[PDB]
Amino acid sequence: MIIPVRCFTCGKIVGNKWEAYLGLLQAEYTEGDALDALGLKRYCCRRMLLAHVDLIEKLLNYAPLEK
Amino acid sequence: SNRPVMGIVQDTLTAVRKFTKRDVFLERGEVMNLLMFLSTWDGKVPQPAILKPRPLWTGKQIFSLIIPGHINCIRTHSTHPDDEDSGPYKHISPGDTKVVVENGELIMGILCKKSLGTSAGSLVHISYLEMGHDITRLFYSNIQ
Amino acid sequence: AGILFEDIFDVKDIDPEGKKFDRVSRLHCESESFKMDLILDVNIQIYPVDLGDKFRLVIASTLYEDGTLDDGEYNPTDDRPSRADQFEYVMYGKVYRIEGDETSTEAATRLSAYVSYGGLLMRLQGDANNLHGFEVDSRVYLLMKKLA
Amino acid sequence: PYANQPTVRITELTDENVKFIIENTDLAVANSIRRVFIAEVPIIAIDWVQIDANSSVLHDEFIAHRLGLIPLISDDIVDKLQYSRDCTCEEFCPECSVEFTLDVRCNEDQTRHVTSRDLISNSPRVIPVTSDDILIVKLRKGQELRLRAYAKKGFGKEHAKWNPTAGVAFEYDPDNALRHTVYPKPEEWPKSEYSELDEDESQAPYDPNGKPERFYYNVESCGSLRPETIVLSALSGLKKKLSDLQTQLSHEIQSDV
Amino acid sequence: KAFEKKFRFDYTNERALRRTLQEDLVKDVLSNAHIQNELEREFERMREDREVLRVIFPTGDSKVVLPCNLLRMIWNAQKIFHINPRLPSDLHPIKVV
Amino acid sequence: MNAPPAFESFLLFEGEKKITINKDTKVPNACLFTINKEDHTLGNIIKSQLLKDPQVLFAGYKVPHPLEHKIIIRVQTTPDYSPQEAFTNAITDLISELSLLEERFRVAIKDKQEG
Numbered sequence: 001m002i003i004p005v006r007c008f009t010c011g012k013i014v015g016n017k018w019e020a021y022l023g024l025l026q027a028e029y030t031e032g033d034a035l036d037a038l039g040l041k042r043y044c045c046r047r048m049l050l051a052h053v054d055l056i057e058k059l060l061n062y063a064p065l066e067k
Numbered sequence: 068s069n070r071p072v073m074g075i076v077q078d079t080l081t082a083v084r085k086f087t088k089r090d091v092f093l094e095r096g097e098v099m100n101l102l103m104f105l106s107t108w109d110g111k112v113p114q115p116a117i118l119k120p121r122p123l124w125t126g127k128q129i130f131s132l133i134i135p136g137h138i139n140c141i142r143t144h145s146t147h148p149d150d151e152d153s154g155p156y157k158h159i160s161p162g163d164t165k166v167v168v169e170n171g172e173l174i175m176g177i178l179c180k181k182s183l184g185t186s187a188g189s190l191v192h193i194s195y196l197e198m199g200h201d202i203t204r205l206f207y208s209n210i211q
Numbered sequence: 212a213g214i215l216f217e218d219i220f221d222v223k224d225i226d227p228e229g230k231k232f233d234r235v236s237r238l239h240c241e242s243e244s245f246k247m248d249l250i251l252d253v254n255i256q257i258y259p260v261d262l263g264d265k266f267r268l269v270i271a272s273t274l275y276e277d278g279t280l281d282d283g284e285y286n287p288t289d290d291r292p293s294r295a296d297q298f299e300y301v302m303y304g305k306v307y308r309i310e311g312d313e314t315s316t317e318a319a320t321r322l323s324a325y326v327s328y329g330g331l332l333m334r335l336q337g338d339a340n341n342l343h344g345f346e347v348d349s350r351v352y353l354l355m356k357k358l359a
Numbered sequence: 360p361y362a363n364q365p366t367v368r369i370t371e372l373t374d375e376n377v378k379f380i381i382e383n384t385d386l387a388v389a390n391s392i393r394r395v396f397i398a399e400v401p402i403i404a405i406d407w408v409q410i411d412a413n414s415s416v417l418h419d420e421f422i423a424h425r426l427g428l429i430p431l432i433s434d435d436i437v438d439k440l441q442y443s444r445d446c447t448c449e450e451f452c453p454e455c456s457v458e459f460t461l462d463v464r465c466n467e468d469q470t471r472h473v474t475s476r477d478l479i480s481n482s483p484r485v486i487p488v489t490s491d492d493i494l495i496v497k498l499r500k501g502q503e504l505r506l507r508a509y510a511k512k513g514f515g516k517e518h519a520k521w522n523p524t525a526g527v528a529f530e531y532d533p534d535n536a537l538r539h540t541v542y543p544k545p546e547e548w549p550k551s552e553y554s555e556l557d558e559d560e561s562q563a564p565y566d567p568n569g570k571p572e573r574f575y576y577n578v579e580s581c582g583s584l585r586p587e588t589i590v591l592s593a594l595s596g597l598k599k600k601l602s603d604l605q606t607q608l609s610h611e612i613q614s615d616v
Numbered sequence: 617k618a619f620e621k622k623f624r625f626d627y628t629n630e631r632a633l634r635r636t637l638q639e640d641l642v643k644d645v646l647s648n649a650h651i652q653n654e655l656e657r658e659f660e661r662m663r664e665d666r667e668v669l670r671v672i673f674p675t676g677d678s679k680v681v682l683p684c685n686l687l688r689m690i691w692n693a694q695k696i697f698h699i700n701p702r703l704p705s706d707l708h709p710i711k712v713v
Numbered sequence: 714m715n716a717p718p719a720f721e722s723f724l725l726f727e728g729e730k731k732i733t734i735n736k737d738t739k740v741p742n743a744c745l746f747t748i749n750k751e752d753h754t755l756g757n758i759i760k761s762q763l764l765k766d767p768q769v770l771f772a773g774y775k776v777p778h779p780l781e782h783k784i785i786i787r788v789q790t791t792p793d794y795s796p797q798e799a800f801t802n803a804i805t806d807l808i809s810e811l812s813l814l815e816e817r818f819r820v821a822i823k824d825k826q827e828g
């Protein structure tokens with residue numbers, strides 16, 4: 001759905017690192033380099049962004065219930 | 068089938084097999100921690116198998132306290148070869164195979180499904196036939 | 212007193228067939244004087260031992276050795292009876308079997324003493340004249356100390 | 360029958376990380392300090408959430424869950440504030456809670472990211488760790504989200520939202536000298552970052568007389584508490600728990616005698 | 617041959633009796649012909665039982681199901697009463713019969 | 714529906730005593746301490762500290778069931794040394810140790826910043 005804050009295993013803040021991760025992937029960095037640049041060292045944190053799927057963008061395509 | 072349905076299974080059986088070997092030596096604090104989980108313990112810490120240079124209890128020595136009352140049982144470990152009974156070391160068991168329990172104490176040998184499992188003449192079967200249902204229930208719970 | 216067996220043994224073997232236990236090795240030892248064959252399992256990391264090591268082995272019913280029962284309990288505050296602490300390596304166990312060579316009419320001339328030290332075993336073969344002090348289901352202390 | 364005297368060396372100290380070594384102490388002492396780092400350290404986190412309007416595609420309790428996990432700067436007033444259970448007032452008061460208000464409506468066509476910066480607190484001392492921005496929900500044009508929240512004082516035992524630390528690294532005896540773990544093949548195990556032995560050999564020789572000491576630490580804060588104040592509050596909380604145990608034990612001893 | 621060697625209770629040796637049985641009971645066993653007659657009757661009954669078993673159990677299958685484990689209970693009696701195999705016993709065989 | 718509230722590991726409602734002292738009749742000079750709403754954080758500490766006392770013959774802790782929040786600590790001491798006194802001494806020892814550790818850690822922190 002949406003990027004979850006507080007990586008499950010340890011609790012490190014990963015809810016603020018999704019947009020920066022996407023930007024790093026979009027411009028130059030590979031996934032590993034982007035994760036290293038974001039400071040996600042423990043693989044529990046790296047799998048948190050790496051495996052994330054942002055369904056929030058897909059859910060925003062539909063018109064809202066109230067205009 | 069005049070066998071027990073209930074036996075030591077899964078984690079407890081593997082940990083018993085690893086726990087009973089000769090190499091298992093337990094320091095003072097570990098022995099104190101383990102003994103409090105013994106429901107039938109009389110509160111008297113046994114003398115360690117090794118006294119010097121440092122006190123070190125053995126897995127069999129602690130497991131002997133779990134054995135209720137005075138149970139006599141003889142089993143064989145899964146890895147026990149058939150050469151030992153024929154040649155020498157029949158009662159020495161260089162691989163520490165076979166099982167001998169005398170006077171409710173695990174004298175020697177490594178336990179497995181052949182001893183604590185569901186089989187005729189198993190150690191738990193002997194405990195039930197000798198002591199009773201309540202004492203065997205306590206034996207099960209203490210082992211676990 | 213309270214002594215059962217006193218001798219100095221020679222380590223002739225360590226791993227005759229193979230190694231089955233990481234922390235425990237088996238000492239195949241031969242004795243001076245009484246010519247007493249010995250097999251013994253000894254913790255290795257705690258008490259290292261190599262081939263051809265002079266070690267004095269003592270079998271005692273009690274550690275105090277003044278002639279009183281030890282009631283088989285572990286208390287660290289048991290210093291006041293002046294425990295026999297001249298040995299580096301001390302074990303505690305019971306005799307579980309005593310074999311012999313007697314056949315009906317004739318008496319046993321050689322005995323084998325089997326002791327389980329809470330899982331570690333020792334076999335002690337030799338003439339019955341000095342080995343008669345062992346009794347089945349009797350508490351035993353093993354005392355060990357290397358020699359130069 | 361008395362305390363050994365521990366010493367502390369601190370190797371690395373940043374705004375996010377603290378690396379220190381505790382020497383000359385029991386294994387259980389170090390382990391319980393590590394456990395208190397996670398569990399018993401008080402911290403301020405959102406616990407009471409009320410949503411007025413929520414047109415987002417995420418359901419109400421989803422947004423409340425995301426809000427509760429947002430860290431809040433608790434470096435100073437977490438000690439001054441009191442647990443709501445122990446507080447005299449009913450519901451919530453400023454002496455027992457901090458009020459948060461969020462009011463976001465997406466009017467432009469471009470999707471608007473509702474972040475932690477949108478949280479508005481009554482007190483300037485607690486900020487949702489924004490001196491990037493923790494994302495709460497994304498709003499499409501026409502969607503709206505208005506809610507009121509109160510932040511309480513709690514610790515890790517209650518809920519993980521009150522965990523003040525990221526992964527707390529604990530390590531003792533990096534060179535395996537006590538043999539607390541036995542490597543079937545020592546040569547294939549990577550050496551620890553605190554290893555004191557040369558590359559040629561694998562492990563230190565066995566030490567029969569040794570006991571666990573010189574416990575290596577690495578406490579990584581979530582930003583809600585400064586990582587040194589995490590250790591200070593952990594020590595203070597454990598001491599307070601032990602002192603309360605002392606008081607109760609003394610009272611029981613006098614009552615029974 | 618092995619059956620007789622294991623179950624006959626040969627009292628003629630007079631030396632093995634002194635080692636296994638107490639010195640007092642050896643003279644009673646040897647002197648009294650009633651003891652010897654009753655022991656021979658016991659052995660004859662056991663031989664008849666052996667023949668009955670061989671009729672009942674062809675294929676020589678000695679593994680049988682019985683209520684109480686006599687060997688384990690004998691061993692329990694040994695351990696409870698601190699029986700020393702190295703010493704002669706005071707148990708009179710006629711009392712056993 | 715059967716999930717216990719969050720405040721069952723530390724909070725004491727009405728009725729429970731924080732620590733309960735029961736003597737052990739099996740052996741002389743042994744006591745059983747039942748600590749309500751506590752976990753291994755305190756039990757392991759107490760067990761480790763008690764073993765330092767040369768007058769403590771037995772010391773340990775256990776959690777009878779993880780779903781419940783209770784600790785049973787069994788202490789046995791030598792004659793003429795009550796186990797309750799041993800527990801009190803261990804707790805005071807821990808107070809002193811923790812205070813000294815905090816003091817030194819604060820000194821180290823202050824030295825690390827601008828030092």
Ligand SMILES: [Zn+2]
Pocket residue numbers: 007008009010011012042043044045046526
């Ligand atoms: Zn993580």
Ligand SMILES: [Zn+2]
Pocket residue numbers: 443446447448449450451452453454455456
């Ligand atoms: Zn209030």
